[PDB]
């Protein structure tokens, strides 16, 4: 009876050290072709929480379980109870397999129509396995993908607002694909929430990953980065210098429509922008970048209206409409009203003369609110310096250091 | 306040579901709350998040979404006309009118700021109240209006420890 000896060894190895022997034993799987674990599962699972059975779940999910061995509901409930009530510390000893399980869950949810119900599971798994609140794990990518596919961007916000420092190794199973797709999906989530600055940051982080080949995630990140830089700013932001010199010569020719879109955007002519958008409408529709292109079209008008304030103190509605090509005083008035409403511009409308006056005197920097703002900026900078000093001391205490120096 | 705890309760209700889809009343309540807080991105994403079958099953979701499109285009006069087109459920009867009041205040801001002189008809369309709110402008608020031209004129309305922390950080 090999199974009895195996389960006895599993029970004894728990809370007794020698975790390497147990890990090797779970790695020696594939001979458990019998599927009679269903009736014997519900005897020890409740007892002593769930300090085991992660490996058995991993080897159950992958072996030709397309409809989860037609027991999707039961397996989903099993993993729900496992993750909800867990030690957290012992399983942290072997994160790799855990991450794989999460990956399988994603592959079991995004497929047909229902990627939403699993968001709240990887949500707990992320903070159950990760070192600290700022540490990149492969499950972050799966959570971002589930939030993107389910059109539920709010749950992923606390796991995107924090800045990643150090990445979990996952026993060497953390591929660069996880990093690239996590940052790409975070960028798409932020663009969905109109947070274009952080979306641009995420896209730039995805692009600047060192590489020697061409990745479709990287190319889509490049396209969306160009679009977001055209929306938030008036130009394509220059990529950081510390990027791979080979990947930056092949991706650029592929994304030529977006580069010429930026080139015609820099001319401040909405008509040519619309003509060229209609000329490569197929490229944007195929890449599903439509909606961002219309946002660029509207941002061109907004930027023209903003530039009107860099020259004028007071301008007629007809003059503004003729200058920025909205073809109508009423459309220009609505545009300026929306711009003031969002705080993007300081102006007032006088309907008696149909005039717009720009009051470019917002702040005198002499109030306690600016004192608090500078205090918050200083606190962020101080915590940044503290993290840098901690990393420096950690790299100094490392045995390889000093020996090489 | 109590609004924070209520939002926490809705977050709890949304977090777990029998199959990831909750009851239509709570979905409508969440969409109405999203419209109330001007968080329109999450509102539209919730609207597309609803499965098409349950979306077409009930017309209350359709009315809530039509209100959402009306407020998305910033069409202020039509917001009140659309909000009155349908009748809401009893449990949300008094709060939705409160939402209207919120929009009221919003329009007031959009008149107090970004408008030196506003046509009386346009002001009334923005605030929704036909002619009587104009009176509230002069008698109560304190503006100055004039007749025969219909030109409304809106008027525009613990540390030592911190410094010790700064010096301690900089000196080391």
């Amino acid at each position: 009876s090999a199974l009895e000896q195996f389960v006895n060894s599993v029970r004894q190895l728990s809370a007794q050290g020698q975790m390497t022997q147990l890990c090797e034993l779970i790695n020696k799987s594939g001979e458990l072709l019998a599927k009679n674990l269903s009736h014997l599962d519900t005897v020890l699972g409740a007892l002593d929480v769930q300090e085991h059975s992660l490996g058995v779940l991993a080897v159950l999910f992958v072996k030709f379980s397309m409809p989860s061995v037609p027991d999707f509901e039961t397996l989903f409930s099993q993993v729900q109870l496992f993750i909800s009530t867990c030690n957290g510390e012992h399983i942290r000893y072997a994160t790799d397999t855990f991450a794989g399980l999460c990956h399988q869950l994603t592959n079991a949810l995004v497929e047909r129509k229902q990627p939403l119900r699993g968001i709240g599971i990887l949500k707990q798994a992320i903070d159950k396995m990760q070192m600290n609140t700022n540490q990149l794990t492969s499950i972050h990518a799966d959570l971002c993908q589930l939030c993107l596919l389910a059109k539920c961007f709010k749950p992923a916000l606390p796991y995107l607002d924090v800045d990643m420092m150090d990445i979990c190794k996952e026993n060497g199973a953390y591929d660069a694909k996880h990093f690239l797709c996590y940052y790409y999906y975070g960028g798409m989530i932020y663009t969905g929430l109109k947070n274009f600055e952080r979306a641009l940051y995420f896209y730039e982080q995805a692009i600047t990953t060192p590489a020697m080949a061409v990745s479709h995630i990287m190319l889509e990140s490049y396209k969306k980065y160009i679009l977001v830089s055209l929306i938030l700013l008036g130009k394509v932001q220059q990529l950081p210098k510390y990027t791979s010199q080979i990947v930056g010569r092949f991706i650029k020719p592929l994304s030529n429509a977006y580069h010429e879109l930026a080139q015609v955007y820099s001319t401040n002519n909405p008509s040519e922008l619309r003509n060229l958008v209609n000329k490569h409408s197929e490229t944007f529709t195929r890449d599903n970048n439509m909606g961002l292109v219309k946002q660029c079209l509207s941002s061109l008008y907004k930027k023209n209206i903003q530039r009107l304030t860099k020259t004028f103190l007071t301008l007629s509605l007809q003059d503004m409409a003729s200058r920025v090509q909205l073809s109508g005083p009423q459309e220009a008035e609505k545009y300026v009203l929306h711009m003031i409403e969002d705080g993007e511009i300081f102006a007032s409308i006088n309907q008696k003369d149909g005039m717009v006056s720009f009051h470019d005197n917002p702040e005198k920097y002499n109030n306690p609110a600016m004192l608090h703002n500078i205090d918050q900026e200083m606190l962020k900078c101080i915590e940044l310096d503290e993290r840098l000093k901690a990393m420096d001391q950690e790299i100094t205490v490392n045995p390889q250091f000093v020996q090489k120096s | 306040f109590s609004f924070k705890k209520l939002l926490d309760q809705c977050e709890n209700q949304e977090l777990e579901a029998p199959g990831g889809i909750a009851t239509p009343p709570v979905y409508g309540q969440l969409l109405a709350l999203y419209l109330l807080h001007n968080d329109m991105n999450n509102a539209r994403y919730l609207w597309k998040r609803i499965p098409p079958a349950i979306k077409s099953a009930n017309s209350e979701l359709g009315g809530i979404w039509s209100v959402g499109q009306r407020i998305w285009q910033r069409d202020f006069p039509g917001i009140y006309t659309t909000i009155n087109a349908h009748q809401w459920s009893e449990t949300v009867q008094p709060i939705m009118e409160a939402l209207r009041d919120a929009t009221r205040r919003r329009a007031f801001a959009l008149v107090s700021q970004a408008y030196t002189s506003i046509i009386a008809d346009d002001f009334a369309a923005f605030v929704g109240l036909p002619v009587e709110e104009a009176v509230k402008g002069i008698l109560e608020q304190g503006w100055q209006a004039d007749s025969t031209t219909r030109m409304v004129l809106p008027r525009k309305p613990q540390q030592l420890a911190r410094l010790t922390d700064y010096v301690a950080f900089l000196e080391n």
Binding site: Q393, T396, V397, P399, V402, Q403 | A168, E171, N172
Partner: peptide, 24 residues
């Protein structure tokens, strides 16, 4: 200030300890 000095001296002690054991 005392915490900063203590941390600096502890880091110094650790690095010289690692330097001593690295000279085998």
């Amino acid at each position: 200030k005392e915490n900063h000095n203590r941390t600096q001296q502890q880091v110094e002690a650790e690095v010289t300890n690692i330097k001593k054991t690295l000279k085998a």
